[PDB]
């Protein structure tokens, strides 16, 4: 067979240890899920420094804690705008997930609180910026470099899926690089507790699984599809399915055809054909052997999964870092006020926050 006795025993033991870890992690998650933390700081504990990101999702600002001098990334949501955009449940659920999960590649919510006008999530500051920027700058990542990031996503989804959390928002724009060169996943607005199927059309065109496009009930296998898109884009510098307009992208996604750059290794192409599999009965991550079909694939043969988890692997790339508040890996944005009204707004809606 493919493994002799020693290798088979070691792999089996490793896979059983993953099960044991995940069962404990689920126990710990569910305790915090059922009893969420609230109101662990306040606005005047922090100096506002700079806007790190802004969009329909709200704002994220670099802030400095006045007493420790520690920097953080503070997501600010306008309660009235959340209500207007019908994002109450997503906003509450994002914070509830972030305060309950614990994994080395998931951003840590250090504090959260609200005031008359806004909701605030104070997360660790991840100074390296988005993978997206580095990828577009360098062009493409070599296979070992892509593999280092991909392994972190595999482990993170293995963790999330064990908690029955579907992620749904994977793309380079949503992956940050920390000071040690490791990945941080931050955005949980599309994540959902789903043990079975769910139906919402959400995501980003290039990363949508065919079953989402086709208006099917779908499951955590959409995250494994998205991983295939991500690995492809990291290694090629462009995603597998693109076009001028989303509808043309969707036609390519559902077609069952994907083409690869000539520099992709055969191992990489084989993995990608099995992740970018339109047939759900054949997609890696959706079969009887679960995540192990991915983790045991030849393309990952050099990956020491425990060493990645323990953050003991030397990263291929360390972003430039000049100090605790350096923002050079983020874009510049016009700076807007943080208005706090004298009157409480939307109090009932956000009781749980």
């Amino acid at each position: 067979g493919h493994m002799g006795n020693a290798a088979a025993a070691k792999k089996g033991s490793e896979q059983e240890s993953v099960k044991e870890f995940l069962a404990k992690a689920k126990e710990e998650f569910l305790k915090k899920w059922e009893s969420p933390s609230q109101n662990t700081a306040q606005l005047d504990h922090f100096d506002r420094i700079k806007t790190l990101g802004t969009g329909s999702f709200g704002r994220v600002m670099l802030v400095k804690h006045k007493e420790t001098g520690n920097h953080y990334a503070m997501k600010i949501l306008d309660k009235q705008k959340v209500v207007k955009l019908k994002q109450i449940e997503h906003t509450l659920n994002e914070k509830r997930i972030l305060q309950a999960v614990n994994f080395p590649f998931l951003v840590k919510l250090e504090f959260s609180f609200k005031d008359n006008s806004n909701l605030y999530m104070v997360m660790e500051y991840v100074p390296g910026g988005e993978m997206f920027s580095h990828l577009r700058r360098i062009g493409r990542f070599s296979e070992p470099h892509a593999r280092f990031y991909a392994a972190q996503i595999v482990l993170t989804f293995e963790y999330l899926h064990s908690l029955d959390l579907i992620y749904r928002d994977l793309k380079p724009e949503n992956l940050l690089i920390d000071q040690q060169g490791y990945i941080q996943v931050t955005d949980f607005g599309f994540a959902k507790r789903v043990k079975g199927r769910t139906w919402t059309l959400c995501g980003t065109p290039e990363y949508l699984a065919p079953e989402i496009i086709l208006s099917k009930g779908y499951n955590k296998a959409v995250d494994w599809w998205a991983l295939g898109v991500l690995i492809y884009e990291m290694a090629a510098g462009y995603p597998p399915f693109f076009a001028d307009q989303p509808i043309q992208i969707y036609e390519k996604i559902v077609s069952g055809k994907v083409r690869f750059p000539s520099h992709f290794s055969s191992d990489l192409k084989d993995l990608l054909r099995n992740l970018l599999q339109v047939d759900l009965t054949k997609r890696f991550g959706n079969l009887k052997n679960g995540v192990n079909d991915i983790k045991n694939h030849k393309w990952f043969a050099t990956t020491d999964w425990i060493a990645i988890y323990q953050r003991k692997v030397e990263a291929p790339f360390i972003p430039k870092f000049k100090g605790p508040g350096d923002t050079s890996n983020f874009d510049d944005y016009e700076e807007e006020e943080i208005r706090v009204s004298i009157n409480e707004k939307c109090g009932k809606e956000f009781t749980e926050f």
């Binding site: 980003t204 065109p205 510098g237 462009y238 693109f242 076009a243």
Partner: peptide, 18 residues
Amino acid sequence: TTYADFIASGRTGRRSAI
């Protein structure tokens, strides 16, 4: 080339959710 096609798509920048 595929790269040139990517540039031509106009979708080389940050991509929003649907």
